[PDB]
Amino acid sequence: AAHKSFRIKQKLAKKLKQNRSVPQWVRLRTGNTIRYNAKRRHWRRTKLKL
Amino acid sequence: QKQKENLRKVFKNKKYKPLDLRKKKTRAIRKALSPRDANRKTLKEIRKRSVFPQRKFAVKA
Amino acid sequence: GRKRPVPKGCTYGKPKSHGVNQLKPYRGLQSIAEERVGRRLGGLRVLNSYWIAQDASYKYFEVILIDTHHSAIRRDPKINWICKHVHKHRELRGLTSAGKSSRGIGKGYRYSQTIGGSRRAAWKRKNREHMHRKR
Amino acid sequence: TKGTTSFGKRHNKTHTICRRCGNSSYHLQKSKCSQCGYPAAKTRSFNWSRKAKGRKAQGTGRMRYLKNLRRRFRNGLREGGAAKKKT
Amino acid sequence: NRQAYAVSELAGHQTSAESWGTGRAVARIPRVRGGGTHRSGQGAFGNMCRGGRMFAPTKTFRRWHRKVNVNQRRYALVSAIAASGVPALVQSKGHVIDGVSEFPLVVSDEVQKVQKTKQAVIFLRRLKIWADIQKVYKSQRFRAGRGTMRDRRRIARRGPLVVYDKDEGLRKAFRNIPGIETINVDKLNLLKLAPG
Amino acid sequence: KQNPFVSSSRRKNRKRHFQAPSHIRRRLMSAPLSKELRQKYNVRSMPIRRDDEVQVIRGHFKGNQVGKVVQAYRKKFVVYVEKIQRENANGTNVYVGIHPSKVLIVKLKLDKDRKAILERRGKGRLAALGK
RNA sequence: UGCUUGGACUACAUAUGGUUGAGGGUUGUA
RNA sequence: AACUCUAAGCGGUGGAUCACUCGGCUCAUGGGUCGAUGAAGAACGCAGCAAACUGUGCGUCAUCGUGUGAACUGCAGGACACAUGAACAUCGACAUUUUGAACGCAUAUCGCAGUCCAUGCUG
RNA sequence: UUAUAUACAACCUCAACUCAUAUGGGACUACCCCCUGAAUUUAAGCAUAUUAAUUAGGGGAGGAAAAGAAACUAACAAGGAUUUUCUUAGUAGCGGCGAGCGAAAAGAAAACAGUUCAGCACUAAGUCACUUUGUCUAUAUGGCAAAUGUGAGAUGCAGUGUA
RNA sequence: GCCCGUAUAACGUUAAUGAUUACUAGAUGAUGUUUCCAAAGAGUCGUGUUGCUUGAUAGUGCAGCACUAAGUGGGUGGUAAACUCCAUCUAAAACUAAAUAUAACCAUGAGACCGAUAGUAAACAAGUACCGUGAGGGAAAGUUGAAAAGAACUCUGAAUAG
RNA sequence: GGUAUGCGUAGAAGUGUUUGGCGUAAGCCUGCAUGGAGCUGCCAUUGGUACAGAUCUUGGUGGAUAGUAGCAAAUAAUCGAAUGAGAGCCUUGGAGGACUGAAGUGGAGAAGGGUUUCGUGUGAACAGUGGUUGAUCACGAGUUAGUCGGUCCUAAGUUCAAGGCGAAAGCGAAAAUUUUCAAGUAAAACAUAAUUU
């Protein structure tokens, strides 16, 4: 940490803003197939590296 | 639009046209021998197309 | 000649395949000396060639390039043939003087394969089995 | 020497993210992108990794202008003409 | 008119098993390579598996049509004409005929020029076989399979045939009644006559 | 049947009815007109509208009813009616959906556009009464 | 004048002119 | 009654059977469409409540004209600016951040420039 | 104009330009094109054969590509551009005369389209392209002349003439 | 015959068949006869010889090397060599739509195909979750009923519950 | 593909079975009980056709045990008050016992982590025991520079202008040869002067 760079500050928001759960109403679409997420990150059961 | 449409009327009547206003059509027919200029037939091939023409008959009994 | 790029003690596999220091290339120099124009010069086609001289450390030819889009050359229609799209870069595809002659092209029976199109597009033509609709 | 006594001595990142890529492949020291070829002017592809090509092939996502081209040339590349009300 | 069908000569073999094998008391079938991903090994490449190729499958040049002879064809045609008449066995293979007035029935050549086929069941209702083709509307049904997903829904018993000599409007007229499938004389294709 | 360019395959003719687009549905949500209305204009069929009047014939209730409509839930292939209701146990009712091909039109709104669709349907059947 | 804020610009290989040309290369007029 | 042996009922772990398939692969006729005017792939920024897939490019879940002719919808809220178009699809108009074949020198650095006008303050 | 003592004019090789004005590396690949050329395998082993003038092979194209108007056949009561299919034929020879390889004109079928270059004599550069100025219009890197404004062009342009 | 559709067809837009008019560009033959000139591709043919390669064998072509051509000549005629002829073509220059090839890309239908341990690696938020740093390896998971009408409210527990 | 005016929401396919029966036998026929939309018999053909097995592939599930194996290293925790549906803990705060001993189990820095840091709120998996707090979720905020630093300079070395070679890609390369391949320098005619590889 603490000496990142301006990709790995902007890359790390996208692997941060994707760490919500499901939108908390959108399981009332038509044909709701979304229970909880596929990409769902913890941070010791899942690594980043890309 | 009027910032575009005013340009192409005052950029009428020139060659060396503006790049962003030059007919963005294809690749494989822009840079290969324009069609008013690629039918420019040759002299010894427009004399054999002058005097013996294709005649529309039916060779039958 | 041409020496085969394997390092320092030569090829593995078989003794059909050992011999290096005399192996000879196939395309003659008069069609290599137009690839070594056509890619260093990104702009122009290739028309013919002719040798001049020879001494022991080079043979060394000339290349008669043609411009492609000088606005003269579109309206010069006795040499209009070469600036359709299908004739450009005629050093690789083998339809210069020597590059025609390199692939074994004529007719008839000193050339009988190559006949199936190009050259060894014979040796994908004749082994092509026709399991019919109705045998 | 390799059981677990080398798992705390492997921290230095030796494969960073490249430019026209996204897949960590640029080998810092030899300055060469692995999956593609950043300093090579060619997407170094091969004819023995058929499966991997299916991730870097023409038609794996955006295709911005290519999509437009399909429709434009289907109408006949009609440009500069705009429509009129139906009569 | 058989079409072709095959499993696509890759399939299964998007692969790189090579045998993390023998022995650690897991079997010999070659094994999918690195993993973390429920694929180590779990076995491609071998025809008793999950994902692997099924047995040496249809390479799509087969003897998939069959070829016939020139004489046996019309010998099978002339052995269909002579199964039109002798009208016993054409009752015993269906086609109830208890109102037709002639075997083999030959109608007048005026009826080639019928226009709207509602006026032509009147022809059949005045040939006492409209109550015959009423057998066909019973037997339209559903195929046994696997008909009802590859679109072959079902059929019924093909009813009467009517040879026209020279066409006027008949082929464009009769086509709507379920079962009647007509013909020109100078073809006389086989399996429209004698089905099955 | 006669022209090869229209299919019949079961995936294919459900391809282009479920996942057909979101304005072609109004070309597919039609209902039969009333029998008296088949003489003012003498056309069989018309698509329903979001504030018209349509009537149940073959549903749960079998129909003797005038009724308007709140909306046309064109994802759900359906149309509501502002008297067919059923609550939960909580005391809150909605409009149980009834598909267009089980209901009957009694009154349309004849606007400027909606009159022009009648004349487009006007001669077209009547031209087919000549032959 | 210098600051900050916009734009336009400013690859290389390269073809035919354009300009300025460099040459105990080759002459000519002196 | 403990327990163990055995049938069936019945509850229970399980997802096999059969059915159903907005999909797969095969079969065959059609057409020429690949960029120096910025392609192909990525990074991001996206919207009212939004992560994705899909859509896009500071005009950012859509876009001028066009066509057809009233809605999308879990909900709030705006519409009915149908009647001078809802929402679609078509699509010609205009747009196209960021990077490539990097067309500034150049990237484990949003870093270093250089020319010229414009536009603000020095003054 | 060269004791290496100056100009000017050409020429000849030859530069430099934020000149003008324009063309190109790249993506894909089934098919196609010139390339480079391996191996388990078969011979009951293997080394020439085979896998094969083959998978990576990558440089090149397109709706065609290459070929194509014979320095061919055949040897006959002759034929006659190129390509694909049926057959020639699993026959001719190549073969550790081992395994195994392997064509072909000729016969019939689709389609059919033949001709510019070079070089005597062809006998007033009669040539070609920019430029600017107008004609004529058009989303033309455009049609008519002109100044005959350049330069290209005799180290040869054009017309007629070609196995 | 409930609905689009599908059936012949009408509606409509774009081409596409140009009689004439104009402008621009050119042309008198073929025809037999003999007078005069009938000019023809130069390190390439071809031989030697090495090395891949061929159905090709005292050679198929394609190549590097040495050679180095003739003008009533040059190749070519499947056994080499002269030697006599004969026949047929004229090397090293250059272009052309077709009938041929199509797992691509784009819109299109089709059946003796599979029915979620099958079928493309995936019917779905499969080249995504995921591990290897890497090259890259790649799985699992479809099918509430006609309608969401999804179980109000009462009782019990602190609750999802019961 | 032919066929039986074939049965089918007045219950069709499989699933069970202490209903009944036919064959030598494989196999059907049949009753009841689920079940909710399609199915079989004769005769022509036929395809990826019947499984106990392959140290067989995949998915449940046993006995041992479904409570055995063992969760034993780092001195060692404790009464009372809370609150809590419920506490040996952790969750606290009150005491006060002993450890870590300043080449610490202490305070802040590097690589790597990537939202863990903080408040607020909490039910279930998560914390190889519990759980009222947690490096889990829910829900909110939170990282300010002219001086700290990347940025400039250059080090071993990437071989990265086109002299060169290679069939091309590109070259397990002290590319020192490459008109001027000079940075130029307030400059002077008449390649600005000796200068820069």
Swiss-Prot record, chain A:
HAMAP family: Ribosomal_eL39. One of its GO terms (cellular component) is cytosolic large ribosomal subunit. It holds the Pfam family Ribosomal_L39. The lineage of its organism: Eukaryota, Metazoa, Ecdysozoa, Arthropoda, Hexapoda. The keyword Ribosomal protein applies. Keywords: Ribonucleoprotein, Ribosomal protein. Gene3D superfamilies: Ribosomal protein L39e. It comes from Drosophila melanogaster (Fruit fly). This is Large ribosomal subunit protein eL39.
Swiss-Prot record, chain C:
The keyword NADP does not apply. Signal peptide: none annotated. Residues 121-135 have a biased composition (Basic residues). Transmembrane segments: none annotated. Keywords: Ribonucleoprotein, Ribosomal protein. One of its GO terms (molecular function) is RNA binding. Residues 116-135 are annotated as: Disordered. One of its GO terms (biological process) is cytoplasmic translation. GO terms for cellular component: cytosolic large ribosomal subunit; cytosolic ribosome. Belongs to the eukaryotic ribosomal protein eL15 family. This is Large ribosomal subunit protein eL15. It comes from Drosophila melanogaster. The gene is RpL15.
Curated annotation (Swiss-Prot), chain D:
The keyword RNA-binding applies. Zn(2+) binds at C18, C21, C33, C36. One of its GO terms (cellular component) is cytosolic large ribosomal subunit. Keywords: Metal-binding, Ribonucleoprotein, Ribosomal protein, RNA-binding, rRNA-binding, Zinc, Zinc-finger. A zinc finger (C4-type) spans 18-36. Binds 1 zinc ion per subunit. Its cofactor is Zn(2+). GO terms for biological process: cytoplasmic translation; translation. GO terms for molecular function: RNA binding; rRNA binding; structural constituent of ribosome; zinc ion binding. Pfam families: Ribosomal_L37e. Gene3D superfamilies: 2.20.25.30. Belongs to the eukaryotic ribosomal protein eL37 family. Binds to the 23S rRNA. This is Large ribosomal subunit protein L37-2. The lineage of its organism: Eukaryota, Metazoa, Ecdysozoa, Arthropoda, Hexapoda. The gene is RpL37-2.
Swiss-Prot record, chain E:
It comes from the Eukaryota. Belongs to the universal ribosomal protein uL4 family. This is Large ribosomal subunit protein uL4. It comes from Drosophila melanogaster.
